[PDB]
Design a protein around this ligand. Structure first.
Ligand SMILES: COc1ccc(CN)cc1OC
Length: 284
């Protein structure tokens, strides 16, 4: 089934929980042996969210190449994304190693450091220009260069440097700060706007390494971001709404990382965002 008639038709029954639960049953299940090894226990923020072994990103440090991060490769769209958990205090360093290795231009953050009174992520970036960060055991220094704080999001320009070698890179930090503590936003417009900024930056483009995307577990809000982006690009490819099938795209994405889209409320919101973002895409 166009997706908005289908939307209308799901919305007037209440098959969302119904549809969601169906995706869950048919999703891929692949092994995660590396994530589960003893030595790696302290590198996982959550027990039940692990990267599969076939798509996990691997550090270049022979010693322990483990990070909770997955490469989501979308062949047709010529899009790749790295989805990862919010860094722990002890993996902060790992996180910036990955970025550097993979040649990413942008980092997309969809959570706040504290939510519902608890801590969801380490503070992995510098808050003032004059107070730069150096990691342990990593040989990297991160410097805040500038920020631009708006009402729904904040964009930071950052400088990442290799101390061993002296190489410098500009990294852009796209931080969506207004996702509510419970549920999903009322309107997707702010989220669509944020997506487009990221896209306008060059961060999602093929000439660079994959964008690094994360929330607390790196599957829910993060899945919403990558799903909508891809569905819309597919929409530009051949200018055709009915041709793009969101459910099938979501299952394909779930071959690379487990659990993408955590609630049925998040699936409805994904649907919402695409239908509406689709009224850019088709020439308006
Ligand atoms: C940049 O190049 C492309 C990127 C994406 C698509 C996606 N269908 C096609 C492209 O060819 C030009």
């Amino acid at each position: 089934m166009e997706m908005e008639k289908e939307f209308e038709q799901i919305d007037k029954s209440g098959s969302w929980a119904a549809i969601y639960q169906d995706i869950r049953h048919e999703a891929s299940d692949f092994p995660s042996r590396v994530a589960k090894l003893p030595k790696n226990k302290n590198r996982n923020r959550y027990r039940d969210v692990s990267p599969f072994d076939h798509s996990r990103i691997k550090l270049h440090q022979e010693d322990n190449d483990y990070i909770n991060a997955s490469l989501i490769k979308m062949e047709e769209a010529q899009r790749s994304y790295i989805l990862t958990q919010g860094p722990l205090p002890n993996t902060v360093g790992h996180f910036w190693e990955m970025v550097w290795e993979q040649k990413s231009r942008g980092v997309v953050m969809l959570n706040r450091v504290m939510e519902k009174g608890s801590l969801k992520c380490a503070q992995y970036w510098p808050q003032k220009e004059e107070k730069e960060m150096i990691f342990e055991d990593t040989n990297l220094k991160l410097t805040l260069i500038s920020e631009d704080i708006k009402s729904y999001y904040t964009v930071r320009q950052l400088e990442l440097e290799n101390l061993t070698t002296q190489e410098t890179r500009e990294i852009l930090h796209f931080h969506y700060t207004t996702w509510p503590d419970f549920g999903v936003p009322e309107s997707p417009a702010s989220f669509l706007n944020f997506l487009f900024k990221v896209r306008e930056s060059g961060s999602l483009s093929p000439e660079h390494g994959p964008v690094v995307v994360h929330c607390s577990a790196g599957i829910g809000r993060s899945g919403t971001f990558c799903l909508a982006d891809t569905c819309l690009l597919l929409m530009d490819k051949r200018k055709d709404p009915s041709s793009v099938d969101i459910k099938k795209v979501l299952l394909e994405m779930r071959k690379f990382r487990m659990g993408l889209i955590q609630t049925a409320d998040q699936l409805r919101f994904s649907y919402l965002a695409v239908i509406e973002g689709a009224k850019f895409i088709m020439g308006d």
